[PDB]
């Protein structure tokens, strides 16, 4: 395995974006600026083994703590999690810090944020990368809700939608939610399809679920002591803007994104699967690509010596 961080032996920052919201950050290393911005539900700590490697190949790293996790303000109110005001505030982020771009790379929901990113905020994204999540082109045509429920991977959105529901069942026990998420594709305990009919993630997967191949007891134990600041409110208000983020993305235009890009797929991920990723090129001239073979949703942990790899090679070609 690479090397990792130890929470206590690293730099922490704080910069406050608004009275109300004040983002958590990890820094580590000199050079161009790489911010790295995690998924669902996830940590600045979901990077641990990308911070000291992107490090020492000469970058300064800022792991975020997305809003809503962690260290990071956490506001109830569901529209302060749509991709439009995420954005801005991550602008103003950079705003206070004195830096005039950054890289950045996302994974799951902040790969679909770094995405956006570039799309509107491109003098500020030097280079962007994603893992597994698209870049899809907004279809002014059709509705959000036509999209998701075509699709029968997608059900547990539906079951993300209505507030307390699936926070009761996320926070009942946090260990449990944390090893039965934290998995190898192969190893996994959960069905995406029929979740609401089921009654819930977890209502046929085990009560004292193993502990997955990819992550240990004390890294399991670290995402839940994280999750009791705020719990999963903030988390799963991203899944509740579908409306809004489409209509932000429609104000495009049909624009490409002109900066360097590139897009990881990985093999494994049946939610995010490699075929999403078909048209991106015809939107994105500056593409390029990596794929990672046995590899699930959880990419930084799952093949954490093949995202560096790719990471660090492109970077050094195209972004910096």
Same mark, same amino acid.
């Given at each position: *395995?690479?090397?990792?961080?130890?929470?206590?032996?690293? %730099?922490? &920052?704080?910069?406050?974006?608004?009275?109300?919201?004040?983002?958590? =950050?990890?820094? *580590?290393?000199?050079?161009?600026?790489?911010?790295?911005?995690?998924?669902?539900?996830?940590?600045?700590?979901? !990077?641990?083994?990308?911070?000291?490697? *992107?490090?020492?190949?000469?970058?300064?790293?800022?792991?975020?703590?997305?809003?809503?996790?962690?260290?990071? /303000?956490?506001?109830?109110?569901?529209?302060?999690?749509?991709?439009?005001?995420?954005?801005?505030?991550?602008?103003?982020?950079?705003?206070?810090?004195? #830096?005039?771009?950054?890289?950045? $790379?996302?994974?799951?929901?902040?790969?679909?944020?770094?995405?956006?990113?570039?799309?509107?905020?491109?003098?500020?994204?030097?280079?962007?990368?994603?893992?597994?999540?698209?870049?899809?082109?907004?279809?002014?045509?059709?509705?959000?809700?036509?999209? $998701?429920?075509?699709?029968?991977?997608?059900?547990?959105?539906?079951? =993300?939608?209505?507030? &307390?529901?699936?926070?009761?069942?996320?926070?009942?026990? *946090? /260990?449990?939610? =944390?090893? %039965?998420?934290?998995?190898?594709?192969?190893? /996994?305990?959960?069905?995406?399809?029929?979740?609401?009919?089921?009654?819930?993630?977890?209502?046929?997967?085990?009560?004292?679920?193993? #502990?997955?191949?990819?992550?240990?007891?004390?890294? $399991?134990?670290?995402?839940?002591?994280?999750?009791?600041?705020?719990?999963? +409110? &903030?988390?799963?208000?991203?899944?509740?803007?579908?409306? +809004?983020?489409?209509?932000?993305?429609?104000?495009?235009? &049909?624009?490409?994104?002109?900066?360097?890009?590139?897009?990881?797929?990985?093999?494994?991920? =049946?939610?995010?699967?490699?075929?999403?990723?078909?048209?991106?090129?015809?939107?994105?001239?500056?593409?390029?690509?990596?794929?990672?073979?046995?590899?699930?949703? !959880?990419?930084?942990?799952?093949?954490?010596?093949?995202?560096?790899?790719?990471?660090?090679?492109?970077?050094?070609?195209?972004? +910096?």
């Amino acid at each position: *395995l690479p090397t990792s961080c130890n929470p206590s032996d690293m %730099s922490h &920052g704080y910069v406050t974006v608004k009275p109300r919201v004040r983002l958590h =950050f990890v820094e *580590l290393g000199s050079g161009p600026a790489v911010c790295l911005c995690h998924g669902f539900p996830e940590s600045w700590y979901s !990077w641990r083994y990308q911070i000291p490697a *992107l490090a020492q190949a000469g970058y300064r790293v800022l792991a975020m703590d997305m809003k809503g996790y962690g260290e990071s /303000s956490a506001p109830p109110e569901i529209e302060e999690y749509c991709m439009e005001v995420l954005c801005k505030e991550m602008v103003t982020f950079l705003d206070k810090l004195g #830096l005039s771009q950054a890289v950045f $790379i996302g994974h799951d929901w902040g790969g679909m944020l770094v995405w956006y990113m570039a799309l509107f905020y491109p003098e500020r994204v030097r280079a962007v990368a994603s893992l597994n999540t698209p870049f899809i082109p907004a279809n002014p045509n059709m509705s959000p809700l036509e999209s $998701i429920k075509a699709n029968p991977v997608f059900d547990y959105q539906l079951y =993300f939608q209505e507030p &307390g529901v699936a926070e009761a069942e996320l926070e009942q026990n *946090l /260990s449990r939610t =944390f090893k %039965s998420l934290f998995r190898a594709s192969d190893e /996994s305990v959960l069905s995406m399809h029929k979740v609401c009919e089921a009654g819930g993630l977890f209502v046929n997967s085990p009560e004292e679920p193993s #502990l997955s191949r990819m992550v240990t007891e004390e890294e $399991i134990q670290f995402y839940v002591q994280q999750f009791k600041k705020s719990g999963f +409110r &903030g988390p799963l208000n991203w899944y509740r803007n579908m409306e +809004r983020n489409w209509k932000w993305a429609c104000k495009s235009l &049909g624009r490409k994104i002109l900066i360097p890009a590139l897009m990881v797929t990985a093999e494994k991920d =049946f939610v995010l699967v490699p075929q999403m990723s078909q048209h991106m090129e015809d939107w994105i001239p500056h593409l390029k690509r990596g794929h990672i073979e046995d590899c699930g949703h !959880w990419t930084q942990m799952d093949k954490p010596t093949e995202v560096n790899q790719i990471l660090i090679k492109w970077l050094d070609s195209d972004a +910096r």
